[PDB]
Design a protein around this nucleic acid. Structure first.
Ligand code: MG
Ligand code: MG
Ligand code: MG
Ligand code: MG
Ligand code: MG
Ligand code: MG
Ligand code: MG
Ligand code: MG
Ligand code: MG
Ligand code: MG
Ligand code: MG
Ligand code: MG
Ligand code: MG
Ligand code: MG
Ligand code: MG
Ligand code: MG
Ligand code: MG
Ligand code: MG
Ligand code: ZN
Lengths: 24, 118, 60, 127, 155, 98, 80, 206
RNA sequence: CCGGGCACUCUAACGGGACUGCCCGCGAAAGCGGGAGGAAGGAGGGGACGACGUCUGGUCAGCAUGGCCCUUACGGCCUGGGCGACACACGUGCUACAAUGCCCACUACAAAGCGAUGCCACCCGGCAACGGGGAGCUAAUCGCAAAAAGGUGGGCCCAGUUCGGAUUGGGGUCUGCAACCCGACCCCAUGAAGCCGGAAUCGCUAGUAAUCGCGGAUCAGCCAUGCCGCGGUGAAUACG
């Protein structure tokens, strides 16, 4: 969930980007 | 399909299954099924002798898994603990190590609450 | 605002790191807005007067 | 030739351009059933037409902007009702008993201070 | 509601059946305000009461509710340190509220994994006259009766 | 052919000030693009009413920076004349770049 | 999960003071207030007295602690 | 304590700002600290003149500073004297060459800032608070005014126990955001402690 | 996109509009119930606004201020430590315990704000954080931005699990004179408790609650899950 550092949504919640949430 | 130091994933998808291996998880799963060109979705029971052999080959040679891996961590902690090192003490006293507040939520590193008379 | 601690005005601190806002009226080193060089309290005081141009009573 | 009506809701603006036809409804250069891709209530938007035997006598090009599909759905419903009355004024005469003409004023209540969400107030204790 | 007697908030008819009761039932299913997935679940449930029943879903639905409606219930009332379970009539308004609420409740206690199945099967067993929902209804009506003794505290 | 965005805090000491640049350039050049509004950029400050504790009262302060356009296409000497240095209000700042 | 991009850090006064002792062979006991400095092979064998905020503690450096910063061996607080 | 500053509460309408100049994100905080510095001088200088309001307009290196007073004579000086000595210290302050006009006040009894500034006066000389205020309110009520009301803080008379004196006459609606009430504060250093004066003067409604 | 045109949306300024004014019933009247017209109906919805006074309420560390006390020092500078300590106890919260769900992919609707050495398009290097290069904007004409939930498709198949992310090992990025004490961030590894919570107890009456994401102030960076604000979806119930 939002708590998962290494997952899509988690990245969103933590506001960041990365392998699990690319910029596009 | 006993892979890493005596593993045994089965009946579930290979990636998901590969997980049950110590030093392995989600990430390294694809890497192995990717490089070793095996469909990640096949049931470990539906694997091919030719594939299991291959899999094991990559996995067992490329990464430090199971027992050996632990040995490393163990010795790693005993290290910064053998040396004066602050983190050493924390590992010793038993309180958290990544600079967290202990006045409250530190149960995971501390254990059950040993309630005392106020 | 201990006077000696109005050494913020001292510009040259050694490292821009040690530079801090400070209210340019009371000395308040907290809730000190930028667009005014003021602290949350004066902003309130002056604003209530009119000395802060445009600054009106927000409502919606 | 053509008939217009506006319509808005929960902060959404729908442009309604009615034209006689076989009932070809578009929205932002998209099939109706395309924009509102399976949103159950979507149908609503056209309820005014189906409320006067229209739809199968009319056609409509629609521009929709601002908010979310649900509001837009209702925002549309309005214009299509206004234009429908703009087309023929004797329509409202029976289009109003369903208030298709009223512009739902219901809107997001401001977020007040000292309270988590306008109304939702923080919880307390030792009281 | 100390001022005046609250308004029975009027609901909009069902898009697919044009019924207000259905919406109500749909609303009880909806959680976190996700009316789509809510509306969905219900409809798939109606389609399932088809592949399994030669009767029209709405027919099933209506009859299911009618059975889960309690006509007597217990309500407390202090009278000397000891508050007695006073049995009294249940107004249609609540009679309906309680039924739908109970349906969705029982339905979600069910074992079938899929939401709509649980709801269809509950609606089904509902009209049948069995199932957890109708159960609660009965345990309740049993509470009244079991207290006729205190009936004189009508009010 | 004359971009001149009028920005001010008072929406009257502007609407009035732009009504000038328009007339004092209407009969001299073309006709101008009339006065154009442009969304305002509202600033906001939310402070706690009193000092120390009492963190649930606050009070809100804004500072809307209104906008305007004007824009005169086809300038004719006498136009830049009726303008030039014939400005008046004090609660305004102007940007020119025709 | 450490950090310090590219370019380890060590305070001058401490650094260009430690190696100054190597030139003279070897010294005995030092003492800095900059516990912020990283340890380096240049120190192996020395003994730096790190300040915890109240005292100067003798900290014998070894090859095994070459990455850690002096402070990690001069505990700030006093507990139970 | 409650009640919004009746000025800041009306700044919109029935009361204009005391600094009507538009700067911007980069300048504003600067052109702000300026006025202060100004009013600072204009404060601990023109006290004797009895400064009501002290506006300040700007147009880039062109500043207004229309100091309103009760005794303009004090601001001016003999001939055109003072209104230059200070017009001098001024540019030393704001390196932006600014004017220094002077307008007069029509009755220092309708000028809340003064009346309050006044009652505060008496309080320092040791007058009788209760009356001082009763008089003040009067001065104001006689010389026009649809309403008025003064208020002093506590320690009145030198009393170890702080109190708070009243006095108010004629409608002084603080809730009718349209009335228009000049309000003015005024401190009062004292042998034993500070006191505070407030004056409200209702004049004209619409 | 260009021409082109202000109709439409919008931007923002002034003004129109609702008064129980009209219709029937009750009434002495005020007003009450229903009805037409109407975008809106009786205070249309939400703000600003808090009387004489109370608690010897809070604040002398915002500031101002009477008295009191210290003046190689109760004043000043600095380096380092501390405010971040932990056997315990409580408040407010966050994330969860899952299938009305989680994951991946593709794909669709927002509002209000912010941006000079700042937002940083596009490009290339990197799994990535980030780095290198670099266009545009002083910003309704450029950027932060992707809204999320949703829709379509596929996966998971009821398991402490593809639920959940604590904790810990290792590697690395950026801000900063400097991240041991004591920053955030990325990637790999680890993968804890938790299966909906005793007594007791909090919020909310409508676009509210519940749920979903977005901006901002402070600010180098950040321990924000806090606060202030924005909009998407959108209920239940009130006899009394
Ligand atoms: Mg997960
Ligand atoms: Mg594993
Ligand atoms: Mg001081
Ligand atoms: Mg700082
Ligand atoms: Mg909301
Ligand atoms: Mg607070
Ligand atoms: Mg709070
Ligand atoms: Mg009022
Ligand atoms: Mg007290
Ligand atoms: Mg106290
Ligand atoms: Mg004092
Ligand atoms: Mg110090
Ligand atoms: Mg603290
Ligand atoms: Mg929290
Ligand atoms: Mg497990
Ligand atoms: Mg489970
Ligand atoms: Mg209420
Ligand atoms: Mg009620
Ligand atoms: Zn201040």
């Amino acid at each position: 969930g939002k708590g998962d550092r290494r997952t899509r949504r988690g990245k969103i919640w933590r506001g960041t980007y990365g392998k699990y949430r690319p910029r596009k | 399909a006993r892979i890493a130091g005596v593993e045994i994933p089965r009946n579930k998808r290979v990636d998901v299954a590969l997980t049950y291996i110590y030093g392995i998880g989600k990430a390294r799963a694809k890497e192995a099924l990717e490089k070793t060109g095996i469909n990640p979705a096949t049931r470990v029971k539906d694997l091919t002798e030719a594939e299991v052999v291959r899999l094991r080959e990559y996995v067992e040679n490329t990464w430090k898994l199971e027992g050996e891996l632990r040995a490393e961590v163990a010795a790693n902690i005993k290290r910064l603990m053998d040396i004066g090192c602050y983190r050493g003490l924390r590992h010793r006293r038993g309180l958290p190590v990544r600079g967290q507040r202990t006045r409250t939520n530190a149960r995971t590193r501390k254990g059950p609450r040993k309630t005392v008379a106020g | 605002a201990r006077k000696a601690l109005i050494e913020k005005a001292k510009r040259t601190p050694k490292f821009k790191v040690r530079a801090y806002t400070r209210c340019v009226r009371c000395g308040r080193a907290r809730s000190v807005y930028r667009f005014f060089g003021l602290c949350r309290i004066c902003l309130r005081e002056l604003a209530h007067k009119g000395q802060l141009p445009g600054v009106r009573k927000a409502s919606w | 030739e053509q008939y217009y009506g506006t319509g808005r809701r929960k902060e959404a603006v729908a442009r309604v351009f009615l034209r006689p036809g076989n009932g070809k409804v578009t929205v932002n250069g998209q099939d109706f059933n395309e924009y509102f891709q399976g949103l159950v209530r979507a149908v609503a938007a056209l309820e005014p037409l189906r409320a006067v035997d229209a739809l199968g006598r009319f056609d409509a090009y629609i521009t929709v902007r601002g908010g979310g599909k649900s509001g837009q759905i209702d925002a549309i419903k309005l214009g299509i009702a206004r234009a429908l009355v703009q087309y023929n004024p004797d329509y409202r005469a029976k289009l109003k008993p369903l208030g298709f003409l009223t512009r739902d004023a219901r809107v997001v209540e401001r977020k007040k201070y000292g309270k988590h969400k306008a109304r939702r107030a923080p919880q307390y204790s030792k009281r | 509601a100390r001022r005046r007697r609250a308004e029975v908030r009027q609901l909009q008819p069902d898009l697919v059946y044009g019924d207000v009761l259905v919406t109500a039932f749909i609303n009880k299913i909806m959680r976190d305000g996700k009316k789509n997935l809510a509306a969905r679940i219900f409809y798939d449930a109606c389609k399932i009461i088809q592949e399994k029943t030669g009767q029209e879903p709405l027919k099933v639905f209506k009859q299911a509710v009618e059975n889960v409606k309690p006509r007597m219930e217990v309500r407390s009332r202090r009278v000397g340190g000891a508050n007695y379970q006073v049995p009294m009539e249940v107004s249609p308004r609540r009679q309906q509220s309680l039924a739908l609420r109970w349906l969705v409740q029982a339905a979600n206690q069910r074992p079938e994994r899929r939401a709509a199945v649980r709801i269809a099967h509950e609606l089904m067993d509902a009209a049948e006259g069995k199932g957890g929902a109708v159960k609660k209804k009965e345990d309740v009506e049993r509470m009244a009766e079991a207290n006729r003794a205190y009936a004189h505290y009508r009010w | 052919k004359i971009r001149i965005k009028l920005r001010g805090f008072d929406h009257k000491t502007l609407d009035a000030s732009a009504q000038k640049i328009v007339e004092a350039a209407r009969r001299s050049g073309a006709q101008v693009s009339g006065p154009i509004p442009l969304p305002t950029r509202v600033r906001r400050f939310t402070v706690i009413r009193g000092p120390f504790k009492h963190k649930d009262s606050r009070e809100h302060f804004e500072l809307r920076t209104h906008n305007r356009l004007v824009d005169i296409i086809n300038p004719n000497r006498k136009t830049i004349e009726q303008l030039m240095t014939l400005d008046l209000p004090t609660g305004v700042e102007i940007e020119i770049k025709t | 999960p450490r950090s310090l991009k590219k370019g380890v850090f060590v305070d001058d006064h401490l650094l260009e003071k430690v190696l100054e002792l190597n030139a003279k062979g070897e010294k005995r006991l030092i003492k800095t207030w900059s516990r912020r400095s990283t340890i380096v092979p240049e120190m192996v064998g020395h003994t730096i007295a790190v300040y915890n905020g109240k005292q100067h503690v003798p900290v014998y450096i070894t090859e095994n602690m070459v990455g850690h910063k002096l402070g990690e061996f001069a505990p700030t607080r006093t507990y139970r | 304590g409650n009640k919004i500053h009746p000025i800041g509460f009306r700044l919109g309408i029935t009361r204009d700002w005391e600094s009507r100049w538009y700067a911007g994100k980069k300048q504003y905080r600067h052109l702000l600290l300026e006025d202060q510095r100004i009013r600072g001088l204009l404060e601990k200088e023109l006290y004797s003149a009895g400064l009501a309001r002290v506006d300040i307009e700007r147009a880039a290196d062109n500043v207004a500073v229309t100091v309103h007073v009760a005794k303009p004579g004090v601001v001016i000086g003999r001939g055109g004297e003072r209104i230059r000595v200070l017009r001098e210290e001024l540019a030393k302050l704001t390196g932006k060459n600014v004017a220094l006009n002077v307008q007069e006040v029509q009755n220092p009894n309708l000028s809340a800032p003064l009346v309050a500034q006044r009652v505060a006066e008496q309080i320092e000389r040791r007058f009788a608070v209760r009356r001082a205020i009763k008089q003040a309110v009067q001065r104001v009520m006689e010389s026009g005014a649809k309403g008025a009301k003064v208020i002093v803080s506590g320690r009145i008379g030198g009393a170890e126990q702080a109190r708070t004196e009243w006095a108010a006459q004629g409608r002084v609606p603080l809730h009718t955001l349209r009335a228009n009430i000049d309000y003015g504060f005024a401190l009062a250093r004292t042998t034993y402690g500070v006191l505070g004066v407030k004056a409200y003067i209702f004049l004209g409604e619409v």
